[PDB]
Ligand binder design. Sequence first.
Ligand code: DHC
Ligand code: DHC
Ligand code: DHC
Ligand code: DHC
Lengths: 121, 121
Amino acid sequence: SLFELGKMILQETGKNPAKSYGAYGCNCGVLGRGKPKDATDRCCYVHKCCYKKLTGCNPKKDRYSYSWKDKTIVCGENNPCLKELCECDKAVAICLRENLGTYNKLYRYHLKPFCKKADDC
Amino acid sequence: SLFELGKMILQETGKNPAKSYGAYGCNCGVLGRGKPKDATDRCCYVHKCCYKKLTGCNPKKDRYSYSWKDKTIVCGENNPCLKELCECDKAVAICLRENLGTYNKLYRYHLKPFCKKADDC
Ligand SMILES: O=C(O)/C=C/c1ccc(O)c(O)c1
Ligand SMILES: O=C(O)/C=C\c1ccc(O)c(O)c1
Ligand SMILES: O=C(O)/C=C\c1ccc(O)c(O)c1
Ligand SMILES: O=C(O)/C=C\c1ccc(O)c(O)c1
Protein backbone atom coordinates (compact mmCIF):
# COMPACT_ATOMS: atom_id res chain seq x y z
CA SER A 1 0.00 0.00 0.00
CA LEU A 2 0.99 3.66 -0.07
CA PHE A 3 2.36 3.29 3.46
CA GLU A 4 4.96 0.72 2.37
CA LEU A 5 5.71 2.56 -0.87
CA GLY A 6 6.32 5.83 0.98
CA LYS A 7 8.43 4.11 3.60
CA MET A 8 10.60 2.49 0.91
CA ILE A 9 11.08 5.82 -0.87
CA LEU A 10 12.14 7.46 2.39
CA GLN A 11 14.53 4.60 3.11
CA GLU A 12 16.23 4.62 -0.28
CA THR A 13 16.30 8.36 -1.07
CA GLY A 14 16.26 9.91 2.37
CA LYS A 15 13.56 12.31 1.12
CA ASN A 16 10.06 13.00 2.41
CA PRO A 17 8.13 10.99 -0.17
CA ALA A 18 4.95 13.09 -0.36
CA LYS A 19 6.82 16.34 -0.85
CA SER A 20 9.39 15.10 -3.33
CA TYR A 21 7.49 12.42 -5.17
CA GLY A 22 3.80 12.86 -4.42
CA ALA A 23 3.20 14.88 -7.60
CA TYR A 24 6.47 15.04 -9.59
CA GLY A 25 6.57 15.33 -13.39
CA CYS A 26 4.04 13.41 -15.46
CA ASN A 27 4.20 10.04 -13.67
CA CYS A 28 4.85 10.42 -9.95
CA GLY A 29 1.62 10.57 -7.98
CA VAL A 30 -1.97 10.34 -9.20
CA LEU A 31 -3.39 10.64 -12.74
CA GLY A 32 -1.64 7.70 -14.36
CA ARG A 33 1.12 8.04 -16.95
CA GLY A 34 2.43 10.57 -19.45
CA LYS A 35 5.60 11.26 -21.45
CA PRO A 36 8.28 11.43 -18.75
CA LYS A 37 10.08 14.70 -18.06
CA ASP A 38 13.36 13.17 -16.84
CA ALA A 39 14.91 10.07 -15.29
CA THR A 40 13.14 10.49 -11.95
CA ASP A 41 9.79 10.72 -13.75
CA ARG A 42 10.70 7.64 -15.81
CA CYS A 43 11.08 5.65 -12.58
CA CYS A 44 7.46 6.42 -11.75
CA TYR A 45 6.42 5.59 -15.33
CA VAL A 46 7.97 2.10 -15.07
CA HIS A 47 6.39 1.74 -11.62
CA LYS A 48 2.92 2.45 -12.99
CA CYS A 49 3.42 -0.09 -15.76
CA CYS A 50 4.54 -2.62 -13.14
CA TYR A 51 1.26 -2.04 -11.29
CA LYS A 52 -0.78 -2.94 -14.40
CA LYS A 53 0.54 -6.50 -14.38
CA LEU A 54 -0.76 -7.08 -10.85
CA THR A 55 -3.65 -9.51 -10.53
CA GLY A 56 -5.46 -10.19 -7.27
CA CYS A 57 -4.32 -7.28 -5.10
CA ASN A 58 -4.76 -3.52 -4.61
CA PRO A 59 -1.51 -1.51 -4.81
CA LYS A 60 -2.97 1.53 -3.04
CA LYS A 61 -4.77 -0.16 -0.15
CA ASP A 62 -3.24 -3.61 0.42
CA ARG A 63 -0.42 -3.66 2.98
CA TYR A 64 2.39 -6.20 2.78
CA SER A 65 5.45 -7.21 4.80
CA TYR A 66 9.08 -6.40 4.05
CA SER A 67 12.33 -6.10 5.98
CA TRP A 68 15.32 -3.77 6.02
CA LYS A 69 18.30 -6.13 5.95
CA ASP A 70 21.90 -5.07 5.23
CA LYS A 71 20.32 -1.73 4.24
CA THR A 72 18.37 -3.47 1.47
CA ILE A 73 14.60 -3.81 1.04
CA VAL A 74 13.79 -7.52 1.28
CA CYS A 75 10.25 -8.42 0.26
CA GLY A 76 8.41 -10.91 2.45
CA GLU A 77 6.85 -14.04 0.96
CA ASN A 78 3.38 -12.55 1.41
CA ASN A 79 1.45 -14.05 -1.50
CA PRO A 80 2.31 -13.98 -5.25
CA CYS A 81 0.44 -10.74 -6.05
CA LEU A 82 1.66 -9.00 -2.87
CA LYS A 83 5.24 -10.10 -3.43
CA GLU A 84 5.09 -8.76 -6.98
CA LEU A 85 3.65 -5.47 -5.69
CA CYS A 86 6.39 -5.29 -3.07
CA GLU A 87 8.97 -5.82 -5.80
CA CYS A 88 7.40 -3.00 -7.92
CA ASP A 89 7.61 -0.62 -4.96
CA LYS A 90 11.17 -1.65 -4.15
CA ALA A 91 12.30 -1.05 -7.72
CA VAL A 92 10.84 2.45 -7.86
CA ALA A 93 12.52 3.45 -4.58
CA ILE A 94 15.88 2.20 -5.86
CA CYS A 95 15.34 3.90 -9.21
CA LEU A 96 14.50 7.21 -7.51
CA ARG A 97 17.64 7.00 -5.37
CA GLU A 98 19.83 6.26 -8.37
CA ASN A 99 18.48 9.35 -10.12
CA LEU A 100 18.48 11.81 -7.23
CA GLY A 101 21.37 13.63 -8.93
CA THR A 102 19.10 14.98 -11.65
CA TYR A 103 16.03 15.59 -9.47
CA ASN A 104 14.65 18.97 -10.52
CA LYS A 105 12.38 20.91 -8.26
CA LEU A 106 10.74 22.59 -11.21
CA TYR A 107 8.88 19.41 -11.89
CA ARG A 108 7.52 19.32 -8.39
CA TYR A 109 3.78 20.05 -8.58
CA HIS A 110 3.98 19.76 -12.37
CA LEU A 111 0.51 20.26 -13.87
CA LYS A 112 -0.21 16.76 -15.16
CA PRO A 113 -2.87 17.90 -17.66
CA PHE A 114 0.12 19.37 -19.51
CA CYS A 115 1.74 16.03 -20.21
CA LYS A 116 1.78 14.36 -23.61
CA LYS A 117 0.20 10.90 -23.89
CA ALA A 118 2.25 7.97 -22.56
CA ASP A 119 3.08 5.07 -24.78
CA ASP A 120 1.27 1.84 -23.93
CA CYS A 121 2.98 -0.23 -21.30
CA SER B 1 -12.11 11.15 -11.38
CA LEU B 2 -9.10 12.73 -9.76
CA PHE B 3 -8.69 14.87 -12.86
CA GLU B 4 -12.05 16.60 -12.38
CA LEU B 5 -11.46 16.93 -8.63
CA GLY B 6 -8.08 18.63 -9.10
CA LYS B 7 -9.50 20.96 -11.73
CA MET B 8 -12.38 22.00 -9.44
CA ILE B 9 -10.00 22.61 -6.55
CA LEU B 10 -7.86 24.84 -8.78
CA GLN B 11 -10.97 26.60 -10.09
CA GLU B 12 -12.36 27.35 -6.63
CA THR B 13 -9.19 28.05 -4.68
CA GLY B 14 -6.86 29.40 -7.37
CA LYS B 15 -4.22 27.10 -5.89
CA ASN B 16 -2.21 24.24 -7.38
CA PRO B 17 -4.09 21.35 -5.77
CA ALA B 18 -1.09 19.04 -5.38
CA LYS B 19 1.06 21.60 -3.53
CA SER B 20 -1.65 22.82 -1.18
CA TYR B 21 -3.80 19.71 -0.66
CA GLY B 22 -1.81 16.69 -1.88
CA ALA B 23 -0.76 15.80 1.69
CA TYR B 24 -2.42 18.28 4.08
CA GLY B 25 -3.30 17.33 7.67
CA CYS B 26 -4.89 13.97 8.39
CA ASN B 27 -7.35 13.75 5.49
CA CYS B 28 -6.19 15.70 2.42
CA GLY B 29 -4.42 13.42 -0.04
CA VAL B 30 -4.02 9.67 0.32
CA LEU B 31 -3.93 7.28 3.31
CA GLY B 32 -7.48 7.29 4.68
CA ARG B 33 -9.15 9.46 7.32
CA GLY B 34 -8.07 10.84 10.71
CA LYS B 35 -9.31 13.38 13.24
CA PRO B 36 -9.13 16.68 11.31
CA LYS B 37 -6.44 19.18 12.34
CA ASP B 38 -8.47 22.20 11.16
CA ALA B 39 -11.25 23.35 8.80
CA THR B 40 -9.29 22.67 5.62
CA ASP B 41 -8.54 19.15 6.86
CA ARG B 42 -12.21 18.70 7.82
CA CYS B 43 -13.25 19.50 4.23
CA CYS B 44 -11.23 16.50 3.08
CA TYR B 45 -12.68 14.34 5.89
CA VAL B 46 -16.21 15.16 4.72
CA HIS B 47 -15.13 14.44 1.12
CA LYS B 48 -13.84 11.00 2.03
CA CYS B 49 -17.04 10.21 3.91
CA CYS B 50 -18.96 11.42 0.83
CA TYR B 51 -17.05 8.94 -1.36
CA LYS B 52 -17.68 6.11 1.10
CA LYS B 53 -21.42 6.48 0.51
CA LEU B 54 -21.15 6.11 -3.28
CA THR B 55 -22.40 2.92 -4.91
CA GLY B 56 -22.10 2.15 -8.61
CA CYS B 57 -19.09 4.17 -9.71
CA ASN B 58 -15.37 4.49 -8.95
CA PRO B 59 -14.59 7.92 -7.41
CA LYS B 60 -10.91 7.76 -8.41
CA LYS B 61 -11.18 6.47 -11.97
CA ASP B 62 -14.62 7.38 -13.30
CA ARG B 63 -14.80 10.52 -15.42
CA TYR B 64 -17.80 12.84 -15.43
CA SER B 65 -18.85 16.04 -17.17
CA TYR B 66 -19.21 19.42 -15.50
CA SER B 67 -19.24 23.06 -16.62
CA TRP B 68 -18.02 26.45 -15.39
CA LYS B 69 -21.05 28.74 -15.56
CA ASP B 70 -21.23 32.20 -13.96
CA LYS B 71 -18.07 31.16 -12.08
CA THR B 72 -19.92 28.21 -10.55
CA ILE B 73 -19.11 24.53 -10.89
CA VAL B 74 -22.14 22.95 -12.55
CA CYS B 75 -22.41 19.16 -12.63
CA GLY B 76 -23.46 17.72 -16.01
CA GLU B 77 -24.65 14.20 -15.17
CA ASN B 78 -27.95 12.44 -14.57
CA ASN B 79 -26.55 9.05 -13.55
CA PRO B 80 -27.07 9.05 -9.80
CA CYS B 81 -23.55 7.87 -8.83
CA LEU B 82 -21.73 10.27 -11.16
CA LYS B 83 -24.03 13.13 -10.12
CA GLU B 84 -23.30 12.42 -6.45
CA LEU B 85 -19.59 12.00 -7.22
CA CYS B 86 -19.53 15.35 -9.01
CA GLU B 87 -21.34 17.00 -6.10
CA CYS B 88 -18.90 15.42 -3.60
CA ASP B 89 -16.05 16.91 -5.58
CA LYS B 90 -17.70 20.29 -6.02
CA ALA B 91 -18.38 20.45 -2.28
CA VAL B 92 -14.79 19.80 -1.25
CA ALA B 93 -13.49 22.35 -3.78
CA ILE B 94 -15.88 24.99 -2.42
CA CYS B 95 -15.05 24.00 1.18
CA LEU B 96 -11.31 24.34 0.58
CA ARG B 97 -11.75 27.82 -0.87
CA GLU B 98 -14.04 28.84 1.99
CA ASN B 99 -11.37 27.80 4.49
CA LEU B 100 -8.30 29.38 2.89
CA GLY B 101 -8.51 31.98 5.67
CA THR B 102 -7.33 29.41 8.24
CA TYR B 103 -5.09 27.32 5.95
CA ASN B 104 -1.84 26.61 7.79
CA LYS B 105 1.26 25.40 6.00
CA LEU B 106 2.44 23.69 9.13
CA TYR B 107 0.00 21.02 8.14
CA ARG B 108 1.55 20.38 4.76
CA TYR B 109 3.21 16.97 4.84
CA HIS B 110 1.71 16.36 8.25
CA LEU B 111 2.88 12.99 9.47
CA LYS B 112 -0.30 11.06 8.58
CA PRO B 113 0.49 7.84 10.47
CA PHE B 114 0.34 10.00 13.62
CA CYS B 115 -3.16 11.40 13.48
CA LYS B 116 -5.88 10.46 15.96
CA LYS B 117 -8.66 8.08 14.91
CA ALA B 118 -11.38 9.65 12.78
CA ASP B 119 -14.98 9.66 13.97
CA ASP B 120 -17.05 7.21 11.95
CA CYS B 121 -18.65 8.30 8.78
O1 DHC C 1 9.28 23.09 -3.35
C1 DHC C 1 10.17 23.97 -3.18
O2 DHC C 1 10.14 25.03 -3.87
C2 DHC C 1 11.29 23.77 -2.17
C3 DHC C 1 11.18 22.95 -1.09
C4 DHC C 1 12.22 21.86 -0.90
C5 DHC C 1 12.94 21.45 -2.01
C6 DHC C 1 13.89 20.46 -1.92
C7 DHC C 1 14.14 19.87 -0.70
O3 DHC C 1 15.11 18.86 -0.63
C8 DHC C 1 13.43 20.27 0.42
O4 DHC C 1 13.68 19.66 1.67
C9 DHC C 1 12.46 21.27 0.33
O1 DHC D 1 19.09 -2.68 -9.32
C1 DHC D 1 20.10 -3.00 -8.63
O2 DHC D 1 20.33 -4.21 -8.37
C2 DHC D 1 21.04 -1.93 -8.12
C3 DHC D 1 20.72 -1.20 -7.03
C4 DHC D 1 20.88 -1.78 -5.64
C5 DHC D 1 22.14 -2.15 -5.18
C6 DHC D 1 22.29 -2.69 -3.91
C7 DHC D 1 21.17 -2.86 -3.11
O3 DHC D 1 21.32 -3.40 -1.82
C8 DHC D 1 19.91 -2.48 -3.56
O4 DHC D 1 18.77 -2.66 -2.74
C9 DHC D 1 19.77 -1.95 -4.83
O1 DHC E 1 0.24 24.50 -10.71
C1 DHC E 1 -0.01 25.74 -10.66
O2 DHC E 1 -1.20 26.15 -10.49
C2 DHC E 1 1.13 26.72 -10.82
C3 DHC E 1 2.00 26.90 -9.81
C4 DHC E 1 1.60 27.66 -8.56
C5 DHC E 1 2.17 28.89 -8.28
C6 DHC E 1 1.78 29.55 -7.12
C7 DHC E 1 0.82 29.02 -6.26
O3 DHC E 1 0.45 29.73 -5.10
C8 DHC E 1 0.25 27.80 -6.54
O4 DHC E 1 -0.71 27.21 -5.69
C9 DHC E 1 0.66 27.13 -7.69
O1 DHC F 1 -0.54 32.77 -1.85
C1 DHC F 1 -0.66 32.94 -0.61
O2 DHC F 1 -1.76 33.33 -0.14
C2 DHC F 1 0.53 32.66 0.30
C3 DHC F 1 1.65 32.10 -0.21
C4 DHC F 1 1.73 30.63 -0.59
C5 DHC F 1 0.60 30.00 -1.10
C6 DHC F 1 0.64 28.66 -1.45
C7 DHC F 1 1.82 27.96 -1.31
O3 DHC F 1 1.86 26.61 -1.66
C8 DHC F 1 2.96 28.58 -0.80
O4 DHC F 1 4.15 27.83 -0.66
C9 DHC F 1 2.92 29.92 -0.45
